[PDB]
Amino acid sequence: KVFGRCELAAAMKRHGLDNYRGYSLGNWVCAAKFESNFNTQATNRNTDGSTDYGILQINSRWWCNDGRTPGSRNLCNIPCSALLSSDITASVNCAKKIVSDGNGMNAWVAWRNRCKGTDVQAWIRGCRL
Numbered sequence: 001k002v003f004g005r006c007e008l009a010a011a012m013k014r015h016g017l018d019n020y021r022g023y024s025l026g027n028w029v030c031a032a033k034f035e036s037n038f039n040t041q042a043t044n045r046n047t048d049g050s051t052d053y054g055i056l057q058i059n060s061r062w063w064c065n066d067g068r069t070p071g072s073r074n075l076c077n078i079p080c081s082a083l084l085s086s087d088i089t090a091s092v093n094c095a096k097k098i099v100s101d102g103n104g105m106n107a108w109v110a111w112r113n114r115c116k117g118t119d120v121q122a123w124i125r126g127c128r129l
Ligand SMILES: [Cl-]
Pocket: 024, 025, 026, 027, 120, 121, 122, 124
């Protein structure tokens, strides 16, 4: 599913991401924009042989099982395929664990390089939330 911007903002808000670990909704929408272009089916192979999955490009090295990432972990206890669903529940639940891991949203390199310190409220402008 390719979410619309305000459609994704609403879904994230309903699942309790707005201000989760102090990160406003615009931060999460901005991260999704640059990680996936709001496409739940996005996958990208990393140099280390792990893969990133879904709207927030969650990596198989630590967070989900894809059966092809050596000496990995599965800290969200989910198949990486669950991160590709039209329903963002698994992605959101796993993102909450990631952003609680100690470096906050810096875990998402694209958030740090493209969202951090920017006017992220622009990402929810116009939305009926
Ligand atoms: Cl915001």
